[PDB]
């Protein structure tokens, strides 16, 4: 391969031989695009005039009141689609095109991805077929409406992989997060790296100083790593990832394999996972289905291994509260998934009010979708 399919001991390409050529072709197509000023130009242009980039950096001044910590917010919810997802999905599509693809393959549980793919497909004109199980509504319609072809997850991931296996010549696979087999993990990060880059330049302007720490929820790690990336080299600023603790780690009904899983081999990669005592892959509970990935990004497992990044957790109630709080004090409705992250920042300041800290959480999306449930 051209790139390093491994982040420490996490990563690899654990997929049937049949899919290796597909993957090899993809890394070649990516390494090429990566250096093409044109590809960049379009992607950048598309991000700009269609998606909405750059995203604003709102500075919360009400919730922090009473404490000595300033909370900045990265408005990934002010982006077309209302979620960071509709970001890398474009670059992948552009990639699919550069490769000569005429169709897109994807899957989803809630539909958040099924939409991004659909919306990205429609604009770029690509035949897109999404895979959904029983969790299958407002998006099924949303997806179909957008031309998409609606057809657990680990299972839904197989069907997808199966399909692609025999068709990759024309159809391309759109991984939903920064997980899966190489070079996906590396691809989705690059197509989500502007988030941190913008965050850096922005904060540098508003406070001529880098943040103390940057919090970001983690379902697969795509949004998290998107924010982290450009700050890795900046040792001063800390990186905090937040996994869904569900009803509580000590209850077993949670979703934080990164810190309570156990490295295994599935999803074409080698990283921490939610599995039984003898190797059976399991689920990951959380109020926000947008965070039900029973695994995590290999670069996240590695970043935490060398202690470069700290990963904490947050239960349902914690997020549910941080959710209502944002509404009432900032007039912003965050995604139950995004809450988790913001919910940790609150605790961070609440526990040490006299503590002077300038942190910024990543708001990966709006909460309009979780309004029904949170209700």
């Amino acid at each position: 391969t051209l790139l390093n399919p491994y982040f420490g001991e996490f990563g690899g390409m654990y997929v049937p031989q049949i899919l290796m050529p597909a993957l090899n072709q993809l890394e070649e197509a990516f390494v090429r695009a990566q250096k093409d000023p044109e590809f960049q130009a379009q992607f950048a242009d598309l991000l700009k005039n269609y998606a909405g980039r750059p995203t604003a950096l709102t500075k919360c001044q009400n919730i922090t009141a009473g404490t000595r910590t300033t909370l900045y917010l990265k408005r990934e919810d002010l982006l077309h689609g209302g979620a960071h997802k509709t970001n890398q999905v474009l670059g992948q599509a552009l990639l699919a095109k550069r490769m000569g693809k005429s169709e897109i393959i994807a899957e989803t549980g809630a539909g958040q991805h099924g939409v991004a793919s659909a919306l990205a497909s429609a604009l770029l004109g690509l035949k897109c077929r999404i895979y959904m199980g029983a969790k299958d509504s407002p998006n099924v319609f949303r997806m179909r409406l957008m031309g998409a072809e609606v057809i657990t997850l680990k299972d839904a991931c197989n069907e997808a992989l199966r399909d692609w296996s025999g068709s990759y010549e024309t159809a391309h696979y759109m991984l939903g997060t920064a997980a899966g087999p190489h070079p996906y993990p590396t691809i989705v990060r690059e197509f989500q790296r502007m988030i941190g880059e913008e965050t850096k330049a922005q904060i540098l302007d508003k406070e001529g100083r880098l943040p103390d720490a940057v919090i970001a929820c983690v379902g697969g790690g795509s949004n998290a790593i998107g924010m982290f990336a450009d700050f890795i080299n900046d040792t001063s600023v800390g990186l905090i990832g937040v996994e869904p603790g569900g009803h509580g780690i000590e209850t077993g009904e949670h979703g934080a394999p990164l810190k309570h899983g156990r490295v295994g081999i599935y999803f074409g990669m080698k990283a921490p996972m939610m599995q039984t005592a003898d190797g059976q892959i399991e689920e990951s509970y959380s109020i926000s289905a947008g965070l039900d990935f029973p695994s995590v990004g290999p670069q996240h497992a590695y970043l935490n291994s060398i202690g470069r990044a700290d990963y904490v957790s947050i239960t349902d109630d914690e997020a549910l509260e941080a959710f209502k709080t944002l509404c009432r004090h900032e007039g912003i409705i965050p995604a139950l998934e995004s809450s988790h992250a913001l919910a940790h920042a609150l605790k961070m300041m609440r526990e040490q009010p006299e503590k002077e800290q300038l942190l910024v959480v990543n708001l990966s999306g709006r909460g309009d979708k979780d309004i029904f449930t949170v209700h």
């Binding site: 390409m13 049937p16 031989q17 050529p21 295994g264 081999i265 996972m273 190797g279 892959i281």
Partner: protein, 237 residues
Amino acid sequence: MERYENLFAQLNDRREGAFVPFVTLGDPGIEQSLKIIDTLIDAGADALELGVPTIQNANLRAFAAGVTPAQCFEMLALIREKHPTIPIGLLMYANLVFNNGIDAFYARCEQVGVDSVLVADVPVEESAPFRQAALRHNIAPIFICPPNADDDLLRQVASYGRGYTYLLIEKLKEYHAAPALQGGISSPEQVSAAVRAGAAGAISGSAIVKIIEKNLASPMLAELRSFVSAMKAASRA
């Protein structure tokens, strides 16, 4: 490992191809599977292809039959207990063999009487750990050789492989790859088709699994008896 060697010996001294039928371990439940294999074996089967929990339904079936990774190794020993010659192949996924240590797994394999193991999700490009650990414990690491194959891929599977190749036939031979075994075989015509094609034999995947699900309520065996008998006869010459 040397078990396969032997099989491909007497098999040639009879100018006939090998017919390895695949099936899920403890599919119907446990005792039934322990029987299906018994039949498959005396029906004509030369080798064996046992997968650990169409094929999908096979798993779903077994699962609903309380078949833990420990319950099978029990069957693997039992089976081997009555059949010391028939080679046994195992179909697994990285995580399972990785779970409780890679070596520990392979070591347990030599302990039950397994001959070859193929990890469906472990490409030649990430098999080192699995390859060595397999060889170390005298286990033939079977690698799949698909259509979109290459020259290097052909050279890699011929060098790293052992026991037999999971299928070209000329290059695989030119490279000295373990007797290639062709595996879409449902009719005696394809069986003999492969033999003549150059393959040391054929494997009937789900092909046989169906016969097991199309009689789920009628303990079927007779169907497997014949189905196999036929398939086998087709290989003879």
